[PDB]
Design a protein around this nucleic acid. Structure first.
Lengths: 151, 100, 127, 99, 110, 208, 83
RNA sequence: AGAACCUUACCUGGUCUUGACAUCCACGGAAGUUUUCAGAGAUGAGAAUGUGCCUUCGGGAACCGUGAGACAGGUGCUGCAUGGCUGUCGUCAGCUCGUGUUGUGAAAUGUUGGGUUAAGUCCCGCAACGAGCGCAACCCUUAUCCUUUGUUGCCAGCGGUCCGGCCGGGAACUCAAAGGAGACUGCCAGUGAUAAACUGGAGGAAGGUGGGGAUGACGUCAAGUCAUCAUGCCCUUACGACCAGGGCUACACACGUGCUACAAUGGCGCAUACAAAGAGAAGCGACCUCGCGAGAGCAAGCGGACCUCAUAAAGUGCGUCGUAGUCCGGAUUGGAGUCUGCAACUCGACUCCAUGAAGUCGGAAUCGCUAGUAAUCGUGGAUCAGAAUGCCACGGUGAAUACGU
């Protein structure tokens, strides 16, 4: 907004692992304020993922996230007659969010049956460095690279 | 509303007042499962015979000042518009603008 | 001897009593696991205790009314915090830091004439 | 026991009435129960304020009916009768009920 | 006693149907009255009576917190059986002597 | 229709109600109707008498009317002759025992309703509306109003195009709830049409 | 439809008319406004000109028409086509 | 804020004409009460009772009847003759005035300028000095505490128990109202022009207008409303009044606002938890019995912190279905019925059994929302015999995002 920047609201860490990031992810996943179901789904995804990759539940998730975080995104300035997409260094708070969102989107897209399962699959893909979220990230990066002349 | 409409309403009310005991009785008779078929039939026919304005489902609640059929309130017997005016004037006891 | 604190959050109203003991929680003559099926709720009720190491030290009898589940839990937590404050009076700072002493004054915003809800305006069109 | 149900729109008036009733009770008899406040009825009303059309234009009124429950535990000869001559202020519907 | 309100009266120097004492005599006999209220500081009594015979002070329809301590104080002498009298007295509470002339403009409550 | 009614917004605080009784949902509408009737009757009767406020108050199946008027003498007539007459008719209207009290209005120039009525009367008898308005304002000021506003509207001087004109003097705070703002209205049924007169009179602020 | 316990509905006057017709053995059309009247077995054979709002339209009653009402065979609106 | 009749203002017929609604006389009859045939009904013709308040008796006030007119009546026209009420820019921070001064004057100044604020908010300057209406405050509500009063509300500690606050009781706690306290940049540090303020922190339930509501300046749009009401030409054996039936529910089509969907963050089945706020006497209607069910019968408790509406639903656990036009979706239609109501054909709602369209996230474009908000879940109320997916209220769960202009 114009007038005043405001402090981001307080977020509680999830009961299972005691993590803020996890909680955020769960929130993102959630729909129609049905938090509980969403959190259950998330947990399920984690468990399966853990089983698959070993490690811990949280650590694996973190790793997965890491492979889909964008260093740089673009924005539309459009000062000229035609529009110029300009790259911008995307901040720590935002980058984490974006990756999560992308992952969620991928999960939603995916052709597997249960939501949780789909999510798990997505996570696995991220970890391995294939899939939808990763592709999206690449695209984002690619665009930035293309428009690197603007800065 | 018109005068005529008001008059009609009044007439209806009067009719209702008149024929209540009989009509009610008839209704009861019609309902009563432990009763003769012929009797029931008679009752049904009897009801038909009675005037239509005798029914309470005929009379419309109008404003007691203006006779406006719509926007009515039961507690006050007034249409919204008149009710508001009353409120403003202090004429409805206890009624004031509410905020919460 | 039993210490006390009132809990309140949304339309919930918890009545938390603290006693010295082993650490068994009863909410309306039911266990914590029985009453709150949700893990989050459980966490929130245990939060203050976790913050100030007195989970094993004290039993607490609770009765809560009104609101839903999360709200109720919050209320309970608040009550617990209050009780703690009453009882020790030297743990206040920690509680403050946590953000549990604060009564969460967020009530549901009333529906407003014109609007379908508190803020949702109906669908607009120029034409 | 005599239960007394005071009902009024003005709260101050109701309060005044209640006090008066208590006074009446307490001189004659003994052990007046007390002036217990019951829940207030906030009967709300919405109305369209335009003569013709403007639906979002509205006034929301209400009538706050207050309740006061006064009880008298021992009805003596002198006490119960004292209320007969002792009428209360206007705009306060009282409702005494013995037993 | 401070204000006396008789029905069907114009001024205090008139006369009334069915009574002995005139209205100035009634106001003097009401000025001698002895009342003892407990809770309030301003009450309104009521006196209503018909029938042949004297009107004592014991005929006032008392409330609960007013006590009329002179049940033989005479006020009127109703002679006609078709006569009635319905006065509404107002009893304040103060001290000293405050008269009608000074209380002619002092009274704020219109 | 911008403004809130100045009496109506203040009924809980500084202004009181006119009809002052309790009734259950059963008898309330009827009571209201009765009030409307009696008030209407009173207005009809005591038009020539300068009457500001009829206050109805019914305890114990008996109606107590209180007429606030500038000149009691014309409402009372001969001592208890006119009032008595009024009473029985009131009772009839109600269907209960009636009791009429008559409050004497000190300073009728500061009572808003009365002023409005006067203005209307003036308009009816073909004076310059503006001069009347001025008189209304001035008089109130003289009497000790903290402020006054008056407004008149429509067919002023029988003109084809209707307009509103208004005179304020002193201060007349309407947004301030604690301000004693005596508001009232009237209507001049002239040869060219109706002319509505509003008048706000600010007595002062109440502190509580 | 109407409750079974209440029976079928027919206007009293209409019924009377029908009865009269039966008694006579005549076949002149009975003009009627009771569109809400149910058809009866005894009404079979009779022509009964039912009102459609505007005019009375003749309805020769048949064995198949019994359960139905008179207004079903007297259409009120008169739509030919849009072009 | 509710068209089957009524409503209703419209159409078709059938009828009335000082009239459905008032006032006035004249004079016939007490009003009214009961019942009969014809008629779609409006209406047009019959049989029974009564004579009350008062009379130098030419009679009266309530309430029917008839004729004369004076009049009634009109939801008929003009919102571009009006009042009142309403929308609107906009809860935008503005709009003015008096006196002074400047200018021949229209006008200007104040009200601009330096800062600052949500704010013509506040300070400082300054040919301005002051004032008013508005930007704020006073009001309701919500967030913490205290005092008072404890039933129909409550159960911490006591005894008893049918393990139900139910009964002795207790007045603690919740809660209920009534009255007080509390938040003012008041306190601390820095920045700032020796300022108004701003940035942070301390305490505190709450922090910088704490959240929400009410509150709408001068005015604008010959904005809306003569069909709420009132109000300054036209109809008056009809543009008035009564009636029955029909219509306002029509249907090649176009648009607006909603609901339900297209599914697995789901559907179905069984178990099971946690609300708030309301309504109720021509009313809400427990329990019990019957009905697959809508409901029916019987029938307490209750003008109601007591009784009833009244099981909250989403949720949680266990099972099942396994990506299908499906155990998704419910339109449509057939049958049979329940209730309301003189009356459900046109045209009510709800139930049961069957039937099982389109629809697999929607082109151009386009709307809402910054927090207990959106999203989603149920609950209640008004109007109301019956008839809501609308409107107005209530709580449940409960996000994302705000770099910046």
């Amino acid at each position: 907004p114009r007038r005043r920047v405001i402090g981001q609201r307080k977020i509680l860490p999830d009961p299972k692992f005691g993590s803020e990031l996890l909680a955020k992810f769960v929130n993102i996943l959630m729909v129609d304020g049905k938090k509980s179901t969403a959190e259950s789904i998330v947990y399920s995804a984690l468990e399966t993922l853990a089983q698959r990759s070993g490690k811990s539940e949280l650590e694996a998730f973190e790793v997965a996230l890491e492979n889909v975080r964008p260093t740089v995104e673009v924005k539309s300035r459009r000062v000229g007659g035609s529009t110029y997409q300009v790259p911008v260094e995307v901040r720590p708070v935002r980058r984490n969010a974006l990756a999560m969102r992308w992952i969620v989107e991928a999960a939603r897209k995916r052709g597997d049956k249960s939501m949780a399962l789909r999510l798990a699959n997505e996570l696995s893909d991220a970890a391995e460095n294939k899939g939808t979220a990763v592709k999206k990230r690449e695209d984002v990066h690619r665009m930035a690279e293309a428009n690197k002349a603007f800065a | 509303a018109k005068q005529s409409m008001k008059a009609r309403e009044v007439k209806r009310v009067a009719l209702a007042d008149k024929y209540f005991a009989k009509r009610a009785e008839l209704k009861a008779i019609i309902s009563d499962v432990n009763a003769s078929d012929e009797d029931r039939w008679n009752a049904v026919l009897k009801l038909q015979t009675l005037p239509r304005d005798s029914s309470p489902s005929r009379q419309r609640n109008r404003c007691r000042q203006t006779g406006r059929p719509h926007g009515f309130l039961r507690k006050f017997g007034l249409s919204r518009i008149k009710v508001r005016e009353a409120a403003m004037r202090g004429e409805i006891p206890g009624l004031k603008k509410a905020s919460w | 001897n039993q210490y006390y604190g009132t809990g309140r959050r949304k339309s919930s109203a918890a009545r938390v009593f603290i006693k010295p003991g082993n650490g068994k929680i009863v909410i309306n003559q039911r266990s914590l696991e029985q009453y709150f099926g949700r893990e989050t709720a459980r966490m929130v009720v245990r939060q203050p205790l976790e913050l100030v190491d007195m989970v094993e030290k004290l039993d607490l009898y609770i009765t809560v009314k009104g609101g839903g589940i999360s709200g109720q839990a919050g209320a309970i937590r608040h009550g617990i915090t209050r009780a703690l404050m009453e009882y020790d009076e030297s743990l206040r700072s920690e509680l403050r830091k946590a953000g549990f002493v604060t009564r969460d004054a967020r009530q549901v915003e009333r529906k407003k004439v014109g609007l379908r809800k508190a803020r949702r305006r109906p669908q607009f069109s120029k034409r | 026991r005599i239960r007394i149900r005071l009902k009024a729109f003005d709260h101050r008036l109701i309060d005044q009435a209640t006090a008066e009733i208590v006074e009446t009770a307490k001189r004659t008899g003994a052990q007046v129960r007390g002036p217990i406040p019951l829940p207030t009825r906030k009967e709300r009303f919405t109305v369209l304020i335009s003569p013709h059309v403007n639906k979002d234009a509205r006034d929301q009124y209400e009538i706050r009916t207050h309740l006061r429950l006064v009880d008298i535990v021992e009805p003596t000869e002198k006490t119960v009768d004292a209320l007969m001559r002792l009428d209360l202020a206007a705009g306060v519907d009282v409702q005494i009920s013995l037993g | 006693v401070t204000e006396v309100e008789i029905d069907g009266v114009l001024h205090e120097y008139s006369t009334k149907e069915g009574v002995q004492e005139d209205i100035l005599e009634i106001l003097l006999n009401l000025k001698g009255l002895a009342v003892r209220v407990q809770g309030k500081d301003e009450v309104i009594l009521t006196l209503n009576k018909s029938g042949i015979g004297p009107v004592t002070a014991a005929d006032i329809t008392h409330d609960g917190d007013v006590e009329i301590v002179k049940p033989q104080h005479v006020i009127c002498h109703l002679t006609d059986e078709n006569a009635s009298i319905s006065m509404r007295i107002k009893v304040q509470r103060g001290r000293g002597y405050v008269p009608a002339s000074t209380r002619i403009h002092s009274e704020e409550d219109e | 229709g911008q403004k809130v009614h100045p009496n109506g917004i203040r009924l809980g605080i500084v202004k009181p109600w006119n009809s002052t009784w309790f009734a259950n949902t059963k008898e309330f509408a009827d009571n209201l109707d009765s009030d409307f009737k009696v008030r209407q009757y009173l207005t009809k009767e005591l038009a020539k008498a300068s009457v500001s406020r009829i206050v109805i108050e019914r305890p114990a199946k008996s109606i107590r009317v209180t007429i606030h008027t500038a000149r009691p003498g014309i409402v009372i007539g001969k001592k208890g002759e006119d009032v008595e007459k009024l009473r029985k008719v009131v009772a009839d209207i109600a269907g209960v025992p009636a009791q009429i009290n008559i409050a004497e209005v000190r300073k009728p120039e500061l009572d808003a309703k009365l002023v409005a009525d006067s203005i209307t009367s003036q308009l009816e008898r073909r004076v310059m509306f503006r001069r009347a308005m001025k008189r209304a304002v001035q008089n109130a000021m003289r009497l000790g109003a903290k402020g006054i506003k008056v407004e008149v509207s429509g067919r002023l001087g029988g003109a084809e195009i209707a307009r509103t004109e208004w005179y304020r003097e002193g201060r007349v705070p309407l947004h301030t709830l604690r301000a004693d703002i005596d508001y009232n209205t009237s209507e001049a049924h002239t040869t060219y049409g109706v002319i509505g007169v509003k008048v706000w009179i600010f007595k002062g602020e109440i502190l509580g | 439809p109407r409750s079974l316990k209440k029976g079928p509905f027919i206007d009293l006057h209409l019924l009377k008319k029908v009865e009269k017709a039966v008694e006579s053995g005549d076949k002149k059309p009975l003009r009627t406004w009771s569109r809400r009247s149910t058809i009866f077995p005894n009404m079979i054979g009779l022509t009964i000109a039912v009102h459609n709002g505007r005019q009375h339209v003749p309805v020769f009653v048949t064995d198949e028409m019994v359960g139905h009402k008179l207004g079903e065979f007297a259409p009120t609106r008169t739509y030919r086509g849009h072009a």
